[PDB]
Design a protein around this ligand. Structure first.
Ligand SMILES: *C(=O)C/C=N/[C@@H](C(=O)O)[C@](C)(Cn1ccnn1)[S-](=O)=O
Ligand SMILES: [Cl-]
Length: 262
Protein backbone atom coordinates (compact mmCIF):
# COMPACT_ATOMS: atom_id res chain seq x y z
CA UNK A 1 0.00 0.00 0.00
CA UNK A 2 0.96 3.66 -0.25
CA UNK A 3 0.38 3.60 3.51
CA UNK A 4 3.30 1.25 4.20
CA UNK A 5 5.39 3.19 1.67
CA UNK A 6 4.72 6.54 3.34
CA UNK A 7 5.59 5.03 6.71
CA UNK A 8 8.90 3.60 5.44
CA UNK A 9 9.75 6.92 3.77
CA UNK A 10 9.00 8.75 7.03
CA UNK A 11 11.15 6.29 8.97
CA UNK A 12 13.99 6.77 6.49
CA UNK A 13 13.70 10.55 6.70
CA UNK A 14 13.69 10.48 10.50
CA UNK A 15 16.69 8.14 10.61
CA UNK A 16 18.83 10.44 8.48
CA UNK A 17 20.19 7.52 6.43
CA UNK A 18 19.35 5.22 3.51
CA UNK A 19 16.96 2.33 4.17
CA UNK A 20 16.40 -0.77 2.02
CA UNK A 21 13.56 -3.20 2.70
CA UNK A 22 12.24 -6.30 0.99
CA UNK A 23 9.45 -8.40 2.50
CA UNK A 24 8.20 -11.55 0.77
CA UNK A 25 4.89 -12.86 2.12
CA UNK A 26 4.66 -16.49 1.05
CA UNK A 27 0.90 -16.65 1.74
CA UNK A 28 0.24 -14.89 -1.57
CA UNK A 29 3.68 -14.49 -3.20
CA UNK A 30 3.52 -10.75 -2.58
CA UNK A 31 6.26 -8.27 -1.79
CA UNK A 32 6.73 -4.96 0.01
CA UNK A 33 9.76 -3.14 -1.38
CA UNK A 34 11.61 0.07 -0.48
CA UNK A 35 14.85 0.91 -2.33
CA UNK A 36 14.86 -2.82 -2.96
CA UNK A 37 16.99 -2.62 -6.14
CA UNK A 38 19.67 -0.38 -4.61
CA UNK A 39 22.94 -1.85 -3.41
CA UNK A 40 23.95 -1.98 0.25
CA UNK A 41 27.02 -3.39 1.97
CA UNK A 42 25.97 -6.77 3.41
CA UNK A 43 28.50 -6.89 6.26
CA UNK A 44 27.96 -10.01 8.38
CA UNK A 45 24.69 -10.87 6.66
CA UNK A 46 26.98 -12.36 3.96
CA UNK A 47 27.86 -15.13 6.46
CA UNK A 48 24.58 -16.83 5.51
CA UNK A 49 25.77 -17.22 1.90
CA UNK A 50 29.20 -18.52 2.96
CA UNK A 51 27.65 -21.10 5.30
CA UNK A 52 25.15 -22.09 2.62
CA UNK A 53 27.98 -22.52 0.10
CA UNK A 54 29.67 -24.94 2.53
CA UNK A 55 26.40 -26.80 3.00
CA UNK A 56 25.97 -27.05 -0.78
CA UNK A 57 29.50 -28.43 -1.15
CA UNK A 58 28.74 -30.97 1.61
CA UNK A 59 25.94 -32.51 -0.49
CA UNK A 60 28.62 -34.26 -2.53
CA UNK A 61 31.31 -34.43 0.20
CA UNK A 62 29.84 -36.29 3.21
CA UNK A 63 32.96 -35.73 5.36
CA UNK A 64 33.14 -31.97 4.74
CA UNK A 65 31.25 -30.75 7.80
CA UNK A 66 33.44 -32.93 10.05
CA UNK A 67 36.70 -31.72 8.48
CA UNK A 68 39.08 -30.26 11.06
CA UNK A 69 40.41 -26.72 10.49
CA UNK A 70 43.36 -25.38 12.47
CA UNK A 71 42.86 -22.10 14.36
CA UNK A 72 46.06 -20.10 14.81
CA UNK A 73 46.97 -16.76 16.36
CA UNK A 74 47.71 -15.65 12.79
CA UNK A 75 44.00 -16.20 11.95
CA UNK A 76 42.65 -13.77 14.55
CA UNK A 77 41.12 -10.75 12.99
CA UNK A 78 38.80 -8.42 14.78
CA UNK A 79 35.99 -10.15 16.72
CA UNK A 80 36.69 -13.84 17.23
CA UNK A 81 34.63 -14.69 20.33
CA UNK A 82 34.54 -18.44 19.58
CA UNK A 83 37.74 -18.91 17.59
CA UNK A 84 39.83 -17.33 20.38
CA UNK A 85 38.88 -20.26 22.64
CA UNK A 86 40.29 -22.76 20.12
CA UNK A 87 43.67 -21.23 19.22
CA UNK A 88 46.24 -23.98 18.56
CA UNK A 89 43.49 -26.58 18.19
CA UNK A 90 41.01 -27.36 15.43
CA UNK A 91 37.32 -26.74 14.84
CA UNK A 92 35.15 -28.66 12.39
CA UNK A 93 33.54 -26.86 9.47
CA UNK A 94 30.16 -27.49 11.15
CA UNK A 95 31.42 -25.78 14.32
CA UNK A 96 32.79 -22.89 12.25
CA UNK A 97 29.46 -22.53 10.43
CA UNK A 98 27.59 -22.38 13.73
CA UNK A 99 30.06 -19.84 15.16
CA UNK A 100 29.81 -17.62 12.07
CA UNK A 101 26.00 -17.70 12.06
CA UNK A 102 25.22 -17.64 15.78
CA UNK A 103 28.01 -15.46 17.24
CA UNK A 104 29.10 -13.64 14.06
CA UNK A 105 32.64 -14.97 14.49
CA UNK A 106 34.87 -13.41 11.83
CA UNK A 107 37.60 -16.08 11.91
CA UNK A 108 34.89 -18.64 11.30
CA UNK A 109 33.67 -16.69 8.26
CA UNK A 110 37.22 -16.54 6.87
CA UNK A 111 37.56 -20.32 7.22
CA UNK A 112 34.26 -20.87 5.41
CA UNK A 113 35.41 -18.54 2.62
CA UNK A 114 38.78 -20.26 2.34
CA UNK A 115 37.29 -23.76 2.27
CA UNK A 116 34.94 -23.00 -0.63
CA UNK A 117 37.57 -21.24 -2.71
CA UNK A 118 37.45 -17.58 -1.79
CA UNK A 119 34.99 -14.74 -2.20
CA UNK A 120 34.49 -15.37 -5.92
CA UNK A 121 33.44 -18.95 -5.18
CA UNK A 122 30.74 -17.73 -2.79
CA UNK A 123 29.63 -15.39 -5.58
CA UNK A 124 29.59 -18.31 -8.05
CA UNK A 125 27.35 -20.23 -5.62
CA UNK A 126 24.95 -17.26 -5.58
CA UNK A 127 24.83 -17.34 -9.39
CA UNK A 128 23.80 -21.04 -9.22
CA UNK A 129 20.78 -19.92 -7.15
CA UNK A 130 19.81 -17.46 -9.86
CA UNK A 131 21.14 -14.51 -7.85
CA UNK A 132 23.02 -12.30 -10.29
CA UNK A 133 23.20 -9.33 -7.85
CA UNK A 134 25.10 -10.65 -4.81
CA UNK A 135 28.83 -10.10 -4.82
CA UNK A 136 31.34 -11.13 -2.17
CA UNK A 137 34.74 -9.64 -2.93
CA UNK A 138 36.76 -9.45 0.29
CA UNK A 139 37.51 -11.47 3.42
CA UNK A 140 37.05 -10.42 7.04
CA UNK A 141 37.56 -7.83 8.38
CA UNK A 142 37.68 -5.53 5.36
CA UNK A 143 34.38 -6.67 3.80
CA UNK A 144 32.55 -4.43 6.32
CA UNK A 145 33.98 -1.01 5.30
CA UNK A 146 30.61 -0.07 3.73
CA UNK A 147 31.94 3.02 1.92
CA UNK A 148 29.20 4.90 0.02
CA UNK A 149 29.50 4.27 -3.71
CA UNK A 150 31.66 1.15 -3.28
CA UNK A 151 30.00 -1.93 -4.85
CA UNK A 152 32.29 -4.44 -3.13
CA UNK A 153 30.52 -6.89 -0.84
CA UNK A 154 27.04 -5.60 -1.70
CA UNK A 155 23.66 -6.88 -2.74
CA UNK A 156 20.14 -5.50 -3.04
CA UNK A 157 17.26 -6.13 -0.60
CA UNK A 158 15.19 -7.77 -3.34
CA UNK A 159 17.96 -10.13 -4.40
CA UNK A 160 18.84 -11.12 -0.84
CA UNK A 161 15.20 -11.73 0.11
CA UNK A 162 14.64 -13.92 -2.95
CA UNK A 163 17.88 -15.82 -2.26
CA UNK A 164 17.03 -16.29 1.42
CA UNK A 165 13.60 -17.65 0.43
CA UNK A 166 15.32 -20.18 -1.84
CA UNK A 167 17.84 -21.24 0.80
CA UNK A 168 15.50 -21.50 3.80
CA UNK A 169 12.04 -22.25 2.30
CA UNK A 170 12.90 -23.55 -1.18
CA UNK A 171 15.15 -26.38 -2.30
CA UNK A 172 18.44 -24.73 -3.22
CA UNK A 173 19.85 -27.05 -0.55
CA UNK A 174 19.01 -30.69 0.09
CA UNK A 175 16.64 -31.71 2.85
CA UNK A 176 19.32 -32.21 5.51
CA UNK A 177 21.26 -29.09 4.53
CA UNK A 178 18.27 -26.74 4.44
CA UNK A 179 17.17 -27.98 7.86
CA UNK A 180 20.70 -27.39 9.16
CA UNK A 181 20.81 -23.82 7.86
CA UNK A 182 17.42 -23.02 9.40
CA UNK A 183 18.41 -24.60 12.71
CA UNK A 184 21.62 -22.56 12.79
CA UNK A 185 19.80 -19.30 12.00
CA UNK A 186 17.06 -19.98 14.57
CA UNK A 187 19.89 -20.38 17.08
CA UNK A 188 21.35 -16.95 16.35
CA UNK A 189 22.25 -15.12 19.55
CA UNK A 190 22.89 -11.64 18.08
CA UNK A 191 19.52 -10.58 16.57
CA UNK A 192 17.08 -9.75 19.36
CA UNK A 193 17.48 -5.97 18.96
CA UNK A 194 16.94 -5.92 15.16
CA UNK A 195 14.02 -7.41 13.16
CA UNK A 196 12.91 -9.49 16.15
CA UNK A 197 12.42 -6.34 18.25
CA UNK A 198 9.72 -5.21 15.79
CA UNK A 199 7.74 -8.47 15.85
CA UNK A 200 5.43 -10.04 18.44
CA UNK A 201 7.11 -12.21 21.06
CA UNK A 202 5.38 -15.38 19.81
CA UNK A 203 6.78 -15.26 16.28
CA UNK A 204 9.65 -17.61 15.39
CA UNK A 205 12.67 -16.09 13.66
CA UNK A 206 15.87 -17.27 12.07
CA UNK A 207 18.03 -14.27 11.24
CA UNK A 208 21.54 -12.96 10.67
CA UNK A 209 22.54 -9.40 11.52
CA UNK A 210 25.45 -7.31 10.33
CA UNK A 211 27.08 -3.97 11.00
CA UNK A 212 29.94 -1.98 9.58
CA UNK A 213 31.31 1.39 8.61
CA UNK A 214 29.07 4.38 8.00
CA UNK A 215 26.74 3.16 10.74
CA UNK A 216 25.66 0.28 8.53
CA UNK A 217 23.09 -1.84 10.37
CA UNK A 218 21.52 -4.88 8.69
CA UNK A 219 19.37 -7.96 9.32
CA UNK A 220 17.98 -10.74 7.12
CA UNK A 221 15.35 -13.13 8.43
CA UNK A 222 13.00 -16.01 7.82
CA UNK A 223 9.92 -15.53 10.01
CA UNK A 224 7.05 -17.79 11.03
CA UNK A 225 4.23 -15.55 12.30
CA UNK A 226 1.78 -17.19 14.66
CA UNK A 227 -0.65 -19.29 12.60
CA UNK A 228 0.56 -17.94 9.24
CA UNK A 229 2.76 -18.92 6.34
CA UNK A 230 6.36 -17.75 6.57
CA UNK A 231 7.81 -14.41 5.56
CA UNK A 232 11.25 -13.39 4.36
CA UNK A 233 12.43 -9.95 5.46
CA UNK A 234 15.60 -8.04 4.56
CA UNK A 235 16.27 -4.69 6.26
CA UNK A 236 19.48 -2.87 5.27
CA UNK A 237 20.43 0.55 6.59
CA UNK A 238 23.43 2.86 6.17
CA UNK A 239 24.30 6.43 7.10
CA UNK A 240 26.24 9.37 5.68
CA UNK A 241 28.85 9.74 8.44
CA UNK A 242 31.85 7.38 8.56
CA UNK A 243 31.61 7.11 12.37
CA UNK A 244 27.82 6.95 12.67
CA UNK A 245 26.54 4.67 15.41
CA UNK A 246 24.52 1.54 14.72
CA UNK A 247 20.73 1.95 14.53
CA UNK A 248 19.19 -1.46 15.24
CA UNK A 249 16.01 0.37 16.28
CA UNK A 250 15.54 1.47 12.65
CA UNK A 251 15.45 -2.18 11.57
CA UNK A 252 12.96 -3.01 14.32
CA UNK A 253 10.78 -0.09 13.23
CA UNK A 254 10.89 -1.19 9.58
CA UNK A 255 9.91 -4.73 10.59
CA UNK A 256 6.96 -3.42 12.62
CA UNK A 257 5.78 -1.25 9.71
CA UNK A 258 5.86 -3.98 7.08
CA UNK A 259 4.35 -6.78 9.21
CA UNK A 260 1.54 -4.65 10.67
CA UNK A 261 -1.65 -6.62 10.05
CA UNK A 262 0.01 -10.04 9.70
C1 LIG B 1 29.38 -8.47 10.72
O1 LIG B 1 28.60 -7.60 10.41
C2 LIG B 1 30.72 -8.23 11.39
C3 LIG B 1 31.10 -6.77 11.46
N1 LIG B 1 32.24 -6.44 11.97
C4 LIG B 1 32.58 -5.01 12.02
C5 LIG B 1 31.51 -4.27 12.89
O2 LIG B 1 30.91 -4.92 13.77
O3 LIG B 1 31.38 -3.05 12.65
C6 LIG B 1 33.97 -4.79 12.61
C7 LIG B 1 34.07 -5.40 13.97
C8 LIG B 1 34.25 -3.27 12.69
N2 LIG B 1 34.41 -2.55 11.30
C9 LIG B 1 33.72 -1.42 10.87
C10 LIG B 1 34.22 -1.18 9.58
N3 LIG B 1 35.11 -2.18 9.29
N4 LIG B 1 35.20 -2.95 10.30
S1 LIG B 1 35.18 -5.62 11.51
O4 LIG B 1 36.49 -5.08 11.98
O5 LIG B 1 35.01 -7.02 11.88
CL1 LIG C 1 3.97 -9.48 21.90
Amino acid sequence: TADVQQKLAELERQSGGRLGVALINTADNSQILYRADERFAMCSTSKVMAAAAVLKKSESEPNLLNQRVEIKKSDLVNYNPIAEKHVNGTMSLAELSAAALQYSDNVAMNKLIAHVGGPASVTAFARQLGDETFRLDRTEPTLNTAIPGDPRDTTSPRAMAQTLRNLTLGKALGDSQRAQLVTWMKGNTTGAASIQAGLPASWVVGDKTGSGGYGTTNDIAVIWPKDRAPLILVTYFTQPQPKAESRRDVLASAAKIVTDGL
